[PDB]
DNA sequence: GGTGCAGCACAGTG
DNA sequence: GCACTGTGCTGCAC
């Protein structure tokens, strides 16, 4: 039941092939973004199934044929598990067309495919994504039926266009500098859309609002900004298993709680097995361990005559695993206990340790625990207080110590826990007082120059109509380029075995580079500083 | 490469008051705990201990009133227990019975035997250092001849590149460095580094100062920081706090306990020939289809940029989220030796970004063939304490920033507040439970118990030490602190 | 036959090699004597080969012809071919 | 100073 | 869920 079924709606209308010089065609941009999405799907070996429908197709193929209804629309690939076959289909077998069709018909046929083919299969979520021009002529006379049916089926939707939504900033309006794919800078302005495009935009906007309030607007993206987000996977997320515990103060006070790994450093899930250079097999190559004396004769050692040990300064003490089991320290099961409270300023950011960050709510479906934890959060906020907590995953777990501070959001409030270090982890040093350095005292002109550099090289602009700072470079939304590079290399090798590793695409650099305006502003101050 | 020197004068046996201890006590405990911490870390930089002013002497040159206690050696358990027997007044009473105390001495010959101890070293010498513990500020004020000879010999050690650090201990009437040791101590190369500590009246401050002076500046790496394509400086990366782990097990012989040199071999089975990464290939199978890449290809695709850092820009500190933590923070310091004039520009940038309250966002490639990580350099200003201890070094604290892949969507449901009276009760509870916190207030019980077991085994003691785990909350103590407040909060559920 | 120089070669690895070689159908011997017409060293120097030849003179009838004093390369070639390979200059020391 | 080798806590997944 | 079986990685270390 943990699986999920998704549908991808591709436009091959005549406008898809149409493109502006210096800008990739919408067809090719959507092709690239779906290639990225299906790469993440297949190379993570997920069990989610995918179907692909094409509208604007020169030909037509669908069970919903009849008359001119649902024509120029082809179900290119039905709903089943992915493979490299559809990947190479997107690579070369997918070609733009010149005809147009109503994307509403594509939505109808995709929903019918979900209704029919998923019979006998039990998923967890159902989602459809759409890519189109909004400039194709269509018919809008069954919208309420479509909305009612899809609400009854409870299927999420998502839309991607060669342009972003209405904005007045420098990222949605074509400013100075050429438009770049995947960058943080400008996009198509309110000067390239058509009246048909405005009509389609209003239709999709009213659909999104009628479905999901204000949040439905968020589910509309451009290809460039979708290339730097996980919104395409936003509808196929798998919630992490909650870790329960019983927070305690003293022996009297206890509150059942549930925690999640809010921030975790991810990692690939496939080791690189070494195999034969000829037969390409790992089994016919044997890995063995060498045991010889720490001498010059290099006498072989039988494994039985080997006993473990430990270094203690000068000496080496022998040891055995039974001894390890019998006198190793043992905790008390799992534990989440409050050692006490301390000032928020007393705990500094630099002391945070561990590879994880935990976010803790009260136990699910426990109003008393919820209100207790909320009141504790409020008390911590008013007192500028953070709670030292002794954490233990289970009996086998190492007993960690750490800090937990309140974190209040509009939709929830939680306790954020980060493991703190023991005194052995600390390594202090000394350095020179730069503020009073007798030889590194900068001139006032240097201070003015670096001030100008900082002013020119800002990555966040303070809007003043609402007097709120808008970040111009949100890194927390950028994905990890490592996985994308790995997927690209694997796909290129699979489709072509006798070619070198492909180079990094331009959009990967663009997504990793600051907006061009920052560089333009920093140009002059950088050279001015260089003279110093 | 570290020698400890301690005076045995009668003043070292005179505690200022009752709750205080004699300077001998703090020195002994400091040395013992330093030995323990060194064992925890590594056997590097062997240690020696020697006393002057004893009624006896055991130095090789037989200079009167210089008794050598332990040569420059690895920290041995027998040595640790021999030192620990001095802990407590029983230790001082025993010590005074065969080495004596309170005798005259010439510090010139004491430093002579220290130089002899240094010359006894025949191995990789990193930093020759003398660590003096005395509360007396004018030993040769009675005769200027001894003072002048000691000053000359100290100049000799400084010419021969020998470090000297002195911890003036607590003395009634205070301590003055300029009286005798202004021309004795190894003065630093900068007045900024010429900060003088205060006379220690406790143990923990003495340990902090001693271990600070002991810890050689070990830069993790030297990386180039690119402000732009042309302007490039060099910065040392430092790892202030890192996961301390139990030492790995060592394979040894069953009978003679001689360590087993352990290696590995990779070879074919059809032909039996030994193989290399060149002889092998990297494989990963998806579905039915296997994909084969050369190892060289894998580390080539891993690489994105050359090692170093490419500055992205600046962003106000408020935008950084404290609840967005991924990896332990590092430290960034300038390095003049690699890049000309780097330090001055670095300090100017540090000061200005402190003034403007903005961090520097920058991409970071640790070393060859690693994908880049977006990180933030937040200016960490120098901060001291009443003891002149550098509790906070100046530089750029490096904090890692997570990508959207590293975040986790969480189950979001109804968010409910609580009545203000319950908030006040919780406030009172927290006030009763408040206390000051220090980053070193806790230690790993697991490693402590492990090393207690090792110490018992080495000492052939069937009486394992039991760690008083501080991480265990003082349950009954805080129950007595709270009383009926917890019950009052309990009826509110 | 074929004999293997156990020192600098590992006893377990030598036993595995002897097992796979005897399962290959050709005569392999565990003891140093003169019957074995092929003895493979382990990237040893020529002077060490001469010293081990003298030791074989001790542990064999004097005046007997030496075995094929080759290296691991010829052994791997023969195992890959499933049969003895023609001897080349890069094999003997 | 620097790859790799090992150990191992946790994760998920039954 | 316990024991475990890989990574990357960073302290080692001239």
At which of A233, A257, A276 does a domain end? A233
Verify if strand D has an atom below 7 Å from the CB of A260.
no
Residue A433 lies in a domain: no
Residue B335 lies in a domain: yes
Residue B276 lies in a domain: no
End-to-end, the C-alpha distance of chain A in Å comes to: 65
Kindly list the residues from chain C whose CB atom is less than 8 angstroms away from the CB atom of residue B271.
76, 79-80
- CA-CA distance, C32 to C46, in Å (whole number)? 19
At which of B372, B400, B428 does a domain end? B400
- Residue A151 vs residues A8, A157, A368, B219: alpha-carbon distances, Å: 19, 11, 34, 60
At which of A391, A425, A459 does a domain end? A425
Beta-bridge partners for A258: A244, A361
Query: What is the extent of the structural domain holding B39?
Result: 2-214
Same domain assignment for residues B391 and B320: yes
Same domain assignment for residues B175 and B27: yes
Residue B88 lies in a domain: yes
Residue B363 lies in a domain: yes
At which of A233, A254, A287 does a domain end? A233
Same domain assignment for residues B55 and B148: yes
Beta-bridge partners for B265: A288
- CA-CA distance, C53 to C64, in Å (whole number)? 11
Yes or no: say if B103 and B65 are a contact pair by the CB < 8 Å rule.
yes
Same domain assignment for residues B232 and B200: no
End-to-end, the C-alpha distance of chain C in Å comes to: 20
Same domain assignment for residues B237 and B350: yes
DSSP SS3 for A412: coil
Verify if strand E has an atom below 7 Å from the CB of B322.
no
Yes or no: say if B388 and B197 are a contact pair by the CB < 8 Å rule.
yes
CA dihedral of residues B442, B444, B445, B449 (deg, nearest 10)? -130
Judged by C1' against the alpha carbon of A397, the nearest nucleotide is D9
Q: What is the radius of gyration, based on Cα positions, of chain B? A: 29
Method: cryo-EM
| Three-state secondary structure readout of B183-251 | CCCCCCCCCCCCCCCCCECCCHHHHHHHHHHHCCCCCCEEEEEECCCCCEEEEEEECCECCCCCCCCCC
- Number of A/C CB contacts below 8 angstroms equals 6
Same domain assignment for residues B324 and B440: no
Same domain assignment for residues B71 and B104: yes
Verify if strand E has an atom below 7 Å from the CB of A394.
yes
Same domain assignment for residues A37 and A66: yes
Same domain assignment for residues B66 and B179: yes
Same domain assignment for residues B210 and B225: no
Residue A210 lies in a domain: yes
CA dihedral of residues A387, A390, A394, A396 (deg, nearest 10)? 160
Judged by C1' against the alpha carbon of B307, the nearest nucleotide is D2
Yes or no: say if A379 and B419 are a contact pair by the CB < 8 Å rule.
no
CATH number for the domain including B391?
A: 2.40.290.10
Contact A290 C8 (CB under 8 A): no
Same domain assignment for residues A92 and A188: yes
- CA-CA distance, A49 to B425, in Å (whole number)? 53
- CA-CA distance, A8 to A53, in Å (whole number)? 6
**Tokens found for residue B343:** 């330090």
**Tokens found for residue B108:** 């010139």
Query: Do the bridges between strand B2-7 and strand B47-52 make them parallel or antiparallel, or are there none, so unpaired?
Result: parallel
Same domain assignment for residues B232 and B132: no
Contact C8 A298 (CB under 8 A): yes
- CA-CA distance, A162 to C64, in Å (whole number)? 87
A403 Cβ contact list (under 8 Å, min separation 6): A347, A352, A386, A387, A388, A389, A417, A418, A420
Residue B90 lies in a domain: yes
Same domain assignment for residues A223 and A256: no
How many separate domains does chain B show? Answer: 3
| Three-state secondary structure readout of A460-509 | EEEECCCCEEEECCCHHHCCCHHHHHHHHHHHHHHHCCCCCCCCCCHHHH
Residue B27 lies in a domain: yes
Same domain assignment for residues B226 and B372: yes
CATH number for the domain including A421?
A: 2.40.290.10
Q: Among A374, A413, A450, select the one facing B349 at the smallest CB separation.
A: A450
Give, in Å, how far the C1' of E12 lies from the CA of A106.
62
Residue A344 lies in a domain: yes
Contact A290 C10 (CB under 8 A): yes
Same domain assignment for residues A30 and A161: yes
Same domain assignment for residues A496 and A409: no
- CA-CA distance, B10 to B315, in Å (whole number)? 60
Chain centroid offset of residue A224 CA: 15
- CA-CA distance, C39 to C14, in Å (whole number)? 12
CATH number for the domain including B462?
A: 1.10.1600.10
Same domain assignment for residues A153 and A251: no
Residue A289 lies in a domain: no
Residue A121 lies in a domain: yes
Chains that touch C (3 or more CB pairs under 8 A): A, B
How many separate domains does chain A show? Answer: 3
- CA-CA distance, B429 to B432, in Å (whole number)? 5
Query: What is the extent of the structural domain holding A523?
Result: 444-530
Task: Catalogue all structural domains in chain C, each as residue range(s) with its CATH number.
Answer: 2-81 (3.40.50.10190)
Judged by C1' against the alpha carbon of B295, the nearest nucleotide is D3
- CA-CA distance, A136 to A99, in Å (whole number)? 9
- CA-CA distance, B134 to B199, in Å (whole number)? 10
């Amino acid at each position: 039941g943990n699986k999920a079924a998704v549908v991808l709606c591709m436009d091959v209308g005549f406008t898809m092939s149409n493109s502006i010089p210096g800008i990739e065609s919408p067809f090719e941009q959507a092709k690239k973004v779906i290639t990225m999405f299906v790469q993440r799907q297949v190379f993570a070996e997920n069990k989610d199934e995918i179907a692909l429908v094409l509208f604007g197709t020169d030909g037509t193929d669908n069970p919903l044929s009849g008359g001119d209804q649902y024509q120029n629309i082809t179900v290119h690939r039905h709903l089943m598990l992915p493979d490299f076959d559809l990947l190479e289909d997107i690579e070369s077998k997918i070609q733009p067309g010149s005809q147009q069709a109503d994307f509403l018909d594509a939505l109808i046929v995709s929903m019918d495919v979900i209704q029919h083919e998923t019979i006998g299969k039990k998923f967890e979520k159902r989602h459809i994504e759409i890519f189109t021009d909004l400039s194709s002529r269509f018919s809008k006379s069954q919208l309420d039926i479509i909305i009612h049916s899809l609400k009854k089926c409870d299927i999420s939707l998502q839309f991607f266009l060669p342009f972003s939504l209405g904005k007045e900033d420098g990222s949605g309006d074509r400013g100075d500098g050429p438009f770049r794919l995947g960058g943080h800078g400008p996009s198509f302005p309110l000067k390239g859309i058509t009246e048909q495009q405005k009509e389609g935009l209003e239709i999709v906007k009213m659909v999104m609002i009628s479905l999901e309030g204000e949040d439905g607007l968020d589910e509309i993206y451009s290809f460039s900004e979708s290339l730097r987000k996980l919104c395409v996977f936003k509808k196929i997320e798998r919630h992490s298993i909650h870790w329960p515990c019983r927070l305690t103060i003293g022996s009297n006070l206890s509150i059942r709680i549930a925690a999640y790994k809010s921030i975790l450093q991810e990692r690939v899930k496939k080791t690189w097995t070494v195999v034969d250079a000829k037969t390409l097999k790992k089994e016919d190559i044997q890995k063995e361990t060498v045991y010889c004396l720490n001498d010059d004769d290099e006498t072989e050692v039988l494994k039985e005559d080997i006993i473990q040990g430990f270094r203690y300064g000068s000496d080496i003490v022998p040891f055995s695993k039974v001894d390890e089991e019998q006198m190793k320290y043992k905790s008390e099961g799992k534990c989440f206990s409050v050692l006490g409270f301390c000032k928020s300023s007393q705990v500094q950011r630099r002391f945070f340790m561990g590879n994880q960050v935990l976010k803790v709510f009260a136990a699910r479906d426990d109003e008393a625990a919820a209100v207790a934890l909320s009141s504790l959060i409020h008390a911590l906020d008013d007192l500028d207080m953070v709670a030292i907590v002794r954490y233990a995953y289970d009996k086998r777990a190492n007993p960690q110590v750490g800090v937990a501070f309140p974190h209040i959001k509009h939709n929830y409030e939680c306790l954020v826990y980060v493991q703190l270090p023991f005194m052995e982890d600390l390594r202090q040093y000394m350095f020179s007082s730069l503020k009073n350095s007798k030889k590194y005292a900068p001139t006032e002109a240097q201070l003015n120059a670096v001030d100008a550099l900082i002013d020119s090289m800002s990555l966040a602009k303070k809007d003043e109509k609402t007097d709120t700072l808008e970040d111009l470079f949100p890194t927390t939304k950028i994905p990890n380029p490592r996985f994308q590079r790995l997927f690209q290399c694997l796909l290129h090798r699979a489709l072509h075995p006798r070619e070198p590793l492909p180079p990094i695409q331009q959009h990967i650099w663009n997504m990793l580079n600051p907006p061009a305006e920052v560089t333009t502003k920093s140009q002059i101050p950088l050279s001015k500083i260089k003279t110093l | 490469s570290l020698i400890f020197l301690v005076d045995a004068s009668k003043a070292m046996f005179e505690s200022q008051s009752e709750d205080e201890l004699t300077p001998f006590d703090m020195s002994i405990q400091c040395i013992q705990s330093v030995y323990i911490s060194k064992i925890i870390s590594s056997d590097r930089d062997l240690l020696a201990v020697v006393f002057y002013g004893t009624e006896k002497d055991k130095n090789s040159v037989n200079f009167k009133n210089i008794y050598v206690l332990q040569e420059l050696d690895n920290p041995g358990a027998k040595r640790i227990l021999e030192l620990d027997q001095f802990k407590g007044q029983q230790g001082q009473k025993r010590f005074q019975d065969m080495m004596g105390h309170g005798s005259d001495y010439s510090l010139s010959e004491v430093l002579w035997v220290c130089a002899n101890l240094f010359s006894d070293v025949q191995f990789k010498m990193s930093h020759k250092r003398i660590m003096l513990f005395t509360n007396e500020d004018n030993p040769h004020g009675n005769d200027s001849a001894k003072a002048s000879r000691a000053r000359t010999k100290a100049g000799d050690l400084r010419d021969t590149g020998i470090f000297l650090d002195l911890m003036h201990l607590k003395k009634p009437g205070g301590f003055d460095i300029s009286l005798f040791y202004r021309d004795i101590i190894s003065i630093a190369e900068d007045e900024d580094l010429r900060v003088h500590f205060e006379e220690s009246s406790k143990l923990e401050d003495l340990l902090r100062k001693v271990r600070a002076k002991e810890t050689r500046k070990r830069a993790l790496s030297r990386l180039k920081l690119k402000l732009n394509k042309d302007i490039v400086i060099s910065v040392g990366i430092y790892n202030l706090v890192q996961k301390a782990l139990k030492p790995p097990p060592i394979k040894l012989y069953r009978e003679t306990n001689e360590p087993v040199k352990t290696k590995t071999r990779t070879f074919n089975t059809s032909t039996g020939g030994l193989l290399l990464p060149s002889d092998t290939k990297r494989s990963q199978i998806y579905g039915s289809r296997q994909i084969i890449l050369e190892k060289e290809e894998t580390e080539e695709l891993k690489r994105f940029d050359d090692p170093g850092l490419m500055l992205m820009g600046f962003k106000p500190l408020v935008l950084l989220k404290k609840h967005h933590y991924l990896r332990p923070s590092l430290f960034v310091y300038p390095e003049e030796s690699l890049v000309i004039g780097s330090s001055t520009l670095f300090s100017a940038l540090l000061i200005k970004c402190l003034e403007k309250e903005v961090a520097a966002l920058c991409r970071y490639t640790p070393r060859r063939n690693i994908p880049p990580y977006f990180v933030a350099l937040v200016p960490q200003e120098e901060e001291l304490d009443d003891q002149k201890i550098q509790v906070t070094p100046p530089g750029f604290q490096l904090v890692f920033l997570p990508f959207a892949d590293d975040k986790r969507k969480m189950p979001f449901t109804e968010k409910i507040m609580a009545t203000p009276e319950q908030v006040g009760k919780m406030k009172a509870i927290v006030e009763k439970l408040r206390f000051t916190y220090r980053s070193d207030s806790f230690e790993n019980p697991v490693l402590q118990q492990h090393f207690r077991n090792l110490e018992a085994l080495a000492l052939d003691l069937m009486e394992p030490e039991q760690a008083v785990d501080l991480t265990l909350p003082k349950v009954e103590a805080m129950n007595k602190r709270l009383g009926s407040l917890v019950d009052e909060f309990k009826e509110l559920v | 036959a074929i004999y293997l120089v156990e020192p600098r070669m590992g006893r377990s690895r030598r036993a595995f090699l002897t097992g796979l070689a005897r399962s290959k159908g050709f005569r392999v011997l565990d003891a140093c004597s003169s019957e074995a017409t092929h003895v493979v060293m382990e990237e040893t120097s020529a002077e060490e080969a001469v010293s081990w030849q003298e030791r074989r003179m001790a542990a064999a009838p004097p005046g007997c012809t030496p075995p094929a004093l080759l290296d691991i390369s010829w052994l791997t070639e023969s195992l890959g071919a499933g049969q003895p390979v023609p001897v080349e200059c890069r094999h003997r020391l």
